[model samples]
Target: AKVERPANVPEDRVYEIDMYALNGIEDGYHEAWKKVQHPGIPDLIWTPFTGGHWIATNGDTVKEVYSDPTRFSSEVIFLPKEEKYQMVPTKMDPPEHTPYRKALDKGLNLAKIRKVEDKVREVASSLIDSFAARGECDFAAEYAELFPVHVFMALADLPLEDIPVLSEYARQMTRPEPEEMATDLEAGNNGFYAYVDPIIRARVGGDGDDLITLMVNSEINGERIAHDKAQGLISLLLLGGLDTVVNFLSFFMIHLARHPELVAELRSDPLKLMRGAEEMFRRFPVVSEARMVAKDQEYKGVFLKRGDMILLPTALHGLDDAANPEPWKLDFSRRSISHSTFGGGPHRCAGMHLARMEVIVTLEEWLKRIPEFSFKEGETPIYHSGIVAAVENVPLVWP
Candidate 1:
């Protein structure tokens, strides 16, 4: 339902970023969210990302409400059913979200992931080996993106050769490409939906022992997991596994190169690098919050009839000044820098174990080969921002 615009508020602030409205180059989907003026739903309206929607700028309201799924709903997280179809728990609400979450969580637990560490580490090391001797390389392309993508592909029991397909698809869906805009985004998106559907079906019926098959046969609350929903979940997981740590590692070294003193400190205490990575993710979180809507007859202070879209950004709360004091500064010693980067409440990301293992092992291997890394002078590293923000090509030299 198209929302009625409220008068007496700064409309521009409330409207989410529209590529047509601003620059063609889209970076900082959330950064455009720095502030907003919307009269329709709430105090701040961020119309930049997908379109104008009431945004939650403060940590207290955003976190409390998002944490309480019963109040704010995700029943319509996708902009229009015509656009995204269903996204499992990512776009489901509460009890409906809970059981699917249980199934996914069970499949990604540390005990399960610990069993795969050697495989993950071996993959990470092998990818690192490809560039370790170069004395120079594009961190994002050669190694950062390379390692976790393969790791996730292996985890899903998908073909390793298809890692590039998944990686490219993830970027296509999130980034700002004119080709993406001109084409029916849905049809292109269905490319991903198409890719996963067969894999899930094959895994379900075929004799394969892996996460997809496990999820396929999984029964929670007295129903076999719907194959399409299982595919959506797997696709999201594959995308997360491919992007999160890949970007994290790329960003990690981008910072290391920028701050050689910090790199030296981390080189001396490599164990601290894990904490540093977490700190960086917290300090500069990526992956904007997923959208949700108010389902009940009302919302807190705002009238949210069933169809009113609510834009509560997880990065807003994660990076809010109050949540983590001086969040702009990286502090490895900070206790409990809980990031909503993966998300919070009902839809927390399940791949934390695998992602962390990759980041840790990749750093271990890369550091052993070349302890010092920094951007080559005179050439700035290219960074990209959108629903996901990261260093696109993190160029570095061991010298």
Candidate 2:
């Protein structure tokens, strides 16, 4: 749905593009988005797509927009801007946003993530074991997607059978079309809330310290975590947990299949796993979220009116030459990697610690089990780009 171009939008600042559908997607997920950075285009270009929002085209622009919530509030995050898609602790600003953030963190904090580390490795290897004998397998269908979902089931202590439906919910939440919103709910988020509500009630007053148990009992500020609030926390927990790892694995493994030397170096020096995870974080930054213009203001050679929406795509940030030079090369020793894979400022992803641990464990496990692998010949994976960018299928073959 297109909107009338506000008077402040200069002709040069407008570029017609859609976040869900990019003009150059055939170039590759990250490659297609770099089109905005071409010569003479403003870093903050206004796309006449998705109700005509601004898209931050490079690292500096993306980070700067995320830094100050005052100018760029999280109130209107989705495009064609909807009022009710409130994301749990996500849509709120700090102070008020802090207590719920605190409540939510208790469920997936570093300590909880540490507790799940063993489980993460267990799930990764078991999934790898299931298909290692096949000689050729679709990496995404068999592993990339299943690894995270299975680990989450283990962490949340939910039944393994629910994986299929849970994945469907997460996918819907991430890739909602403009047509889907009128259906009176974040169809996916509501599904999670329904799925979680009974669990929270069942766990209420219980002392078991699993994810749902802790979340339901967690105190917000000084009171018990309200049912309404508990739902948000878990929604985020599931959405973030399921989507990030699933897509990151697909992006990283595709690279691993093509670059045999990186795997060789990793095998030779296991210590590189940590840095390899960080390097993966930088290149495979999958999320692209929007923030609303809090008030009229001029920024980076452009003027904004209050209520305007701007997109901050981390893919652009990590790939931008200004932030990380030689953007395409892998540097296992390249400390101080630059990117907002987990996002920035106060709303930085609450699950970042777990995300890192998941990456390292998967790398260590995958390499040990399947040391030599390559993309299966003649079958290229295609990506779905939306709130989360993801590869559909990654066919892999091993000797």
Candidate 3:
């Protein structure tokens, strides 16, 4: 796709931050986004990256835009214009978005998810046990990806062996490829659909406790959801399940390793560990979603043209000094943990409760067993930034 500066954007409002193609080195994607600030760059800037989209960096701006989805639509979510696959309610707005979201919330029943908490803890403990005796492990490669992947598989009733294949496809969809090639996002989409298609067919009217069954049997306006629409819903579920918490684990563990005292405190007090998880969510948010300009309007003095893509980064909210005091520091005892880590508005993450449970349980189990660990000597963890921020590897050593 050819890059063109948005004609509607004023010359002064355009900033040259490429959201899709950034590779952060020293401080990772979190700091990479933080470094894009200056007096010239306002809260909302028309970035020429990913085919020219507005970027909402301020916490207030992010929430404002998200709250009024009528003006800032979710119709065209992906930047640079990829496949037009409607990701269920995520890509839908208002009255159309309502029913699907309700179905999703019901599917993600908190009681059912609570029942799986022990299993989640078991998954975390089991993974740590694999490398505990070895004294060292690539945490991202070994645990971060697999732990959440396993929970997702168990929740969706998927086969564990297919995780590697699914992980690769998910990686392609979120991160930029080597040499900036057109990634196989379609392959991931199709793979997920193929995996869930048969299951949806089998569970439409069946008595099953998995998410697929809930979605398949969901009703919209007093009628069963259409097969293709069900596929769309399941596709979003698969993507969300595979991606979000995977990186959250990597980032959270990295922070814990660097701050041993904090880990010691959390281990001593389980309540702090649980509250610390919320801080981790704020400090190291992974997802940055895009929104389409619903109408040509002036927002905060900048002209937003209809159909232009806008990136609402969750990372930015956590780092906003106005909303967070000493925004860079991870303070568990902070008064107000107000941020957009799980997004906001009608599209707030439906699976957030499950994601939080996975993180909290992992913390409890890992700290209980291997309470002391640090980054391997001379091994700087690398992270990639795109739709979602991700750590490539986290090598740690424990005695």
Query: Which model scores highest in TM-score?
Result: 2
How would you order the candidates by TM-score, starting with the best? 2, 3, 1
Q: Pick the candidate with the highest lDDT.
A: 2
Model 2, backbone clash pairs (residues 3+ apart or across chains), number: 0
Structural similarity to truth (TM-score) of each candidate: 0.81, 0.94, 0.92
The RMSD of every model to the true structure, in order and in angstroms, is: 4.5, 2.1, 2.4
- Ten-residue stretch with the least lDDT total in model 1: 19-28
- The segments of candidate 1 whose C-alpha lies over 4 angstroms from its true place after superposition are 1-4, 7-50, 78-82, 164-202, 205-209, 275-277, 295-306
TM-score of predicted structure 1: 0.81
lDDT string for model 3 (266-293, tens) is 8788787787667878898888888888
Error of 3 at 170 (Å): 4.3
Q: Please list the residue runs of candidate 2 whose C-alpha ends up more than 4 Å from where it truly belongs after superposition.
A: 175-190
* Candidate 3 residue 332 C-alpha distance from true site, Å: 1.3
